Paper text:
For example, density for the ClpS NTE was present in both the ClpA D1 and D2 rings in classes I and II, but only in the D1 ring of class III. Loss of D2 pore-1 loop engagement with the ClpS NTE is a major feature distinguishing our class-III structures from classes I and II. Three additional features of the class-III D2 ring are noteworthy. Coincident with the pore-1-loop rotation, the ClpA channel in the D2 ring of class III was ~2 Å wider than in classes I and II. Second the D2 rigid-body interface between the small AAA+ domain of subunit E and its neighboring large AAA+ domain in subunit F was broken in class III. Finally, the D2 ring contained ADP in three adjacent subunits in class III, whereas classes I and II contained no more than two ADPs in the D2 ring. Moreover, the portion of the ClpS NTE in the D1 ring of class-III structures is bound in the same fashion as our class-I and class-II structures.
ClpAP, a two-ring AAA+ protease, degrades N-end-rule proteins bound by the ClpS adaptor. AAA+ proteases, such as ClpAP, consist of a hexameric AAA+ unfoldase (for example, ClpA6) and a self-compartmentalized peptidase (for example, ClpP14). Each ClpA subunit has two AAA+ modules, called D1 and D2, that associate in the hexamer to form two stacked rings.
Numbering used by the authors:
A (entry chain D): 380 to 748
B (entry chain I), D (entry chain H), E (entry chain J): 2 to 192
C (entry chain C): 570 to 749
F (entry chain E): 570 to 748
């Protein structure tokens, strides 16, 4: 196992040295770890743990310790992000396969292009996935990498950069954190030459810097977010008969991404507009965050179910998804609380209650300290 | 004159003709007497639309008083050949050739405006020459007439004898009568 | 960059590439194989005409535009790979299945796939334009996913035989986990 | 010769013809004798404006001396089908077909300049040929006459009997008289 | 009017007319009476395509009623001169010198639509003047006739006597009949 | 340029900006304000037609097309600055004249500008197209410049006690010179 595992997960080190390193560390760890209740023998599980520490990647013992975490990964991500279950299943299933031993030998854990409307959770599910797994989040904003010359920074440094620290941002970031989530927001904005860089990442699992250091992407989840097809879908036809502009989104995606790049993608997820039922869950989530913020100042907030529904109708916009909910939450709740928090009953004591009258159609805020 | 129009695209602002802008949305216009040049133009438009998105169905607005039969048949063949369903709408009036293209639309996608009109008559063509030439020329008129009636009967679903009796002389069919005849599926009202 | 092509002219015509220091490398025994996706968009798109056109030739014209004539003359031959036919796809599916079995052998589970099931996988994932990569994804979505949950969450933690069959009435695959 | 006009935009100056510039403001122009090709343009302009803003109201300036009725039906049917209310303003003169489109405007949005004239009369179509053919063509125009009178009576609000007696011969109505007849709601004035 | 179509490319957006866009796809339209000016345009298109891709196949949609025989030979010479296989399709009617170009396509690539009609007849031309000149001109019109029959025989494969007998009088051949005669390899009849 | 909006997306969405150099700029306290004149042009201009179409919603339509939905979604709120009505216009002239009075107060000069003069100053000072930007010159040129010239060298060297009143015939401001 030491030899076979070293070849797979330990790079930039030759085989007779890699195995001896694993073998030596296993003897050192077992000898001095248990003061009492010490195993004289060195089982295969010890070797797997050693390689995991050296490579900063989980071992193959997930069937016992982390089985609970993976089982509840999808459920926990549903609470944080409502709707878009197809994206959660794709990410969690891709992870399960890798831990179970069915992941691609020379490709990343996953490569998913999340395309959809604004405020639908394209960049939220990725941030929550990393938090759920407790792994570093590598976030790259492609808005910076608009031109061809900026792309070189990912795999190196500008021409003739005699100064040190000439290592690629993407290559060095991945090497520091082999297990992490790689988010390339607004990948459409990036120069077409950036798609050529990812071909070896998705298909070969490694990207090489100009210096020659090999970055391993076999254990990183690659997620890209684009708003390529929202404009085409929102476009309205000019004719007597309305057109079903359902496939127009994919056609735009096909033009922006060459077939070779799309083929490498594990799955293309199309996020959809938030439904009215889903908005109710979103209102509850924002209120929960507000409660946490108030808890820091010692204020407790309780809202009536009726008031929650009223907030949903005011902020429900198909085009803007869930982001407008924050605005109504800010205007309706944060504005009165802010004035009172600075000066008034909310300085201390909390015990806030919110209700509304159907005839008035306006929320009522009552503070009793 | 043709009024230009503005379209807002992801790339930015773009200026299109009135007909060109409608072509982007798969709306093709058939207007005036059928002729080889305009028929060829419609044929070209259909092929371009198929390449852009074969799944999406094509829309054709037919407002024509009838014209050359040979030119029109090229349009019909192209409509059936291409995978997209060529929806047909009768704006104002449709003649025998115009109505032949209207009925040729896919099932469930043929429409007629409420105040639209239709006309169907046998093909009228005259040749002058020797009796021997007339015999060969006359035979083609009978063959095409049968082919047109057979195709018309196929789309409408009515008996060939009924199509032959009605086609013998000019017959005007209003929008409600066309639906019963089978030329069009239904009238377009508040889509 | 086009400069790379100029660097290979002596590699293929003379066999020796020299470093800036002046030492010469020998390429007389190194098999040189280049891969290009030129004209892929031309093949993917469909000609605007009644008769579909084979865009294999369009790729060759693109090759001429990208590569200089001197570079192309030195080449032994330009091999134009062809699309995967339905017949070879069945062989391709068998290749991925054995790769899956090797991964499964380490876990201790043996997989058995009926011939009818293998054909069903091919039809669902067949895409001439996308080649063989979709076949891996359909197998991953259909075969690897159920096995992964079972291996982690139950019925396959301990090595057991697996059997796959196709239900003609339902047109869906079936599985027998059969632990131990 | 159509003069060009510059419209200032945030990005920069945009050059459009005078007709196209007004089309952006929903101001369509109907001019000259109605025909299959001008109607196709007019309906095309209406469809373009509908998708942009269906709530906003289109404005059709009618200055036509009359034309073929069949072509006009496409304009009439299109106006009724589209959600936007079509405001018809009679400039100079509105003949039988022009008046039909004018009265066909949405209620409350029809106007006539104080000096315009409105002429209404029965269609004057004619046909020649065999006695059997004349009967079918003659019968059809009476059917069309019924539709013109029934749709005119609906918009004007007068009884069908009243419309037929007045339309027996050419009747020229002044702008104030049009309001009484019910062809237009009011006379356009600068508020 | 000719519609303008936008070709999406990675480098950027490009605007082309409907006919020019099709030319980029190796599609040529031979529509209308054959003439020197129109034939020159087709000749120029073939040469441009040959240079762009000689190995690839060209297409020629023939929807024409025939015309000048000598002008058509410029296309026939160019079709055989250029390395590309000039596949031919027939839309609507094909007549004298229309069919000659339709049967000159590469073997296995000529096609006719189901409802397309093909006509073949001997050259028709007359000269008025002195008897000496009529004899010279008459010999010229006979020699050209034999050359077309020889060439038609080559592609179709029928003997010269068969072509001369049929071509003496106007002969209309349906789309399936053309396959039996050999003018076209087969009918497309594809979706 | 459109590329600038793409830079602001991460600013508003994430609150942190990374320069090409490599440093991490964290600015979560800075408030962000942008000023545009996109909607005013459509609303102020009348429709090109006999009928005046409703332009109430026209201003929002321009902003929707001019600014991408993603850019607008991140914004907290879009606030419209409405044209200054006559009632508020009186306050603007009051602030400018009172400001000048404060400056003159240290010097010892006093002013007694009439309320009617305020109305005439407002029309010239405020323009619908240019707003109150030309109003700067109207107050300084009409009031400060004539009196300032006299203060440096005039009939009255000092003492102030100046007064102003509207002149119907000359449309000019009276200047009082009491030593
Ligand atoms: N389904 C959702 N549930 C909860 N919050 C959501 C949801 N969709 C969007 N959000 C919120 O909106 C933001 C995410 O927007 P995002 O989808 O990244 O936008 P874009 O597609 O424009 O990049 C975050 O503030 C996130 O909390």
């Amino acid at each position: 196992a030491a030899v076979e595992l070293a070849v797979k997960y330990i790079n930039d080190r030759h085989l007779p040295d890699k195995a001896i390193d694993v073998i030596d560390e296993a003897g050192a760890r077992a000898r001095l770890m248990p003061v009492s209740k010490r195993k004289k023998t060195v089982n295969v599980a010890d070797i797997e743990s050693v390689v995991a520490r050296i490579a900063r990647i989980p071992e193959k013992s997930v069937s016992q310790s982390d089985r609970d975490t993976l089982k509840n990964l999808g459920d926990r991500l549903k609470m944080l992000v409502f709707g878009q279950d197809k994206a959660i299943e794709a990410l969690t299933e891709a992870i399960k396969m890798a831990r179970a031993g069915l992941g691609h030998e020379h490709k990343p854990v996953g490569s998913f292009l999340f395309a959809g409307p604004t405020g639908v959770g394209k960049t939220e599910v990725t941030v929550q996935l990393s938090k759920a797994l407790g792994i570093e989040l590598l976030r790259f904003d492609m808005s910076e990498y608009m031109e061809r010359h900026t792309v070189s920074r990912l795999i190196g440094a500008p021409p003739g950069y005699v100064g040190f620290d000439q290592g690629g941002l993407l290559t060095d970031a991945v090497i520091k954190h082999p297990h992490a989530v790689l988010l390339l927001d607004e990948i459409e904005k990036a120069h077409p030459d950036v798609f050529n860089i990812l071909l070896q990442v998705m298909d070969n699992g490694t990207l090489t810097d100009n210096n020659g250091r090999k970055a391993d992407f076999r254990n990183v989840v690659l997620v890209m977010t684009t708003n390529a097809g929202v404009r085409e879908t929102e476009r309205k036809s000019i004719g007597l008969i309305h057109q079903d502009n359902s496939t127009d989104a994919m056609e735009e995606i096909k033009k922006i991404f060459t077939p070779e790049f799309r083929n490498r993608l594990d799955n293309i997820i199309w996020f959809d507009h938030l439904s009215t039922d889903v908005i109710h869950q979103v209102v509850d989530k924002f209120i929960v965050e507000l409660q946490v913020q108030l808890d820091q100042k010692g204020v407790s907030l309780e809202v009536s179910q009726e008031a929650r529904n009223w907030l949903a109708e005011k902020g429900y916009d198909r085009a803007m998804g869930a982001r407008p909910m924050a605005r109504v939450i800010q205007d309706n709740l944060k504005k009165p609380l802010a004035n009172e928090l600075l000066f008034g009953s909310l300085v201390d004591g909390g015990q806030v209650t919110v209700a509304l009258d159907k005839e008035k159609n306006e929320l009522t805020y009552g503070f009793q300290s | 004159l043709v009024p230009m129009v503005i379209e807002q695209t992801s790339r930015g602002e773009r200026s299109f003709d009135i007909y060109s802008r409608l072509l982007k949305e798969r709306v093709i216009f058939l207007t005036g007497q059928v002729e080889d040049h305009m028929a060829n133009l419609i044929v070209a438009q259909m092929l371009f639309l198929e390449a852009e998105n074969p799944e999406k169905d094509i829309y054709l607005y037919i407002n024509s008083p009838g014209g050359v039969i040979t030119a029109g048949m090229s349009i019909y063949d192209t409509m059936q050949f291409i995978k997209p369903d060529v929806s047909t709408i009768c704006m104002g009036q449709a003649a025998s050739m115009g109505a032949f293209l209207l009925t040729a639309g896919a099932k469930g996608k043929r429409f007629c405006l409420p105040n639209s009109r239709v006309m169907i008559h046998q093909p009228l063509g005259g040749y002058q020459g020797q009796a021997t030439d007339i015999e060969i020329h006359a035979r083609e008129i009978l063959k095409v007439k049968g082919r047109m009636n057979e195709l018309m009967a196929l789309h409408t679903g009515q008996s060939l004898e009924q199509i032959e009796r009605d086609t013998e002389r000019d017959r005007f069919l209003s929008a409600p009568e066309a639906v019963e005849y089978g030329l069009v599926d239904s009238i377009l009202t508040h889509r | 960059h086009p400069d790379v092509f100029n660097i290979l002219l002596q590699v293929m015509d003379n066999g020796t590439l020299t470093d800036n220091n002046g030492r010469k490398a020998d390429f007389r025994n190194v098999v040189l194989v280049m891969t290009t996706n030129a004209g892929v968009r031309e093949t993917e798109r469909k000609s605007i005409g009644l008769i579909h056109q084979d865009n294999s030739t369009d790729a060759m014209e693109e090759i001429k535009k990208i590569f200089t004539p001197e570079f192309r003359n030195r080449l032994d031959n330009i091999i134009w790979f062809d699309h995967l036919s339905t017949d070879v796809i069945h062989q391709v599916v068998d290749k991925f299945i054995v790769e899956l079995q090797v991964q499964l052998d380490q876990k201790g589970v043996s997989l058995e796939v009926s011939q009818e099931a293998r054909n069903w996988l091919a039809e669902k994932g067949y895409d001439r334009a996308m080649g063989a990569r979709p076949m891996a994804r359909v197998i991953q979505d259909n075969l690897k996913k159920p096995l992964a949950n079972e291996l982690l969450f139950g019925s396959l933690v301990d090595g057991g035989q697996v059997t796959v069959a196709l239900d003609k009435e339902k047109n869906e695959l079936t599985y027998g986990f059969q632990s131990a």
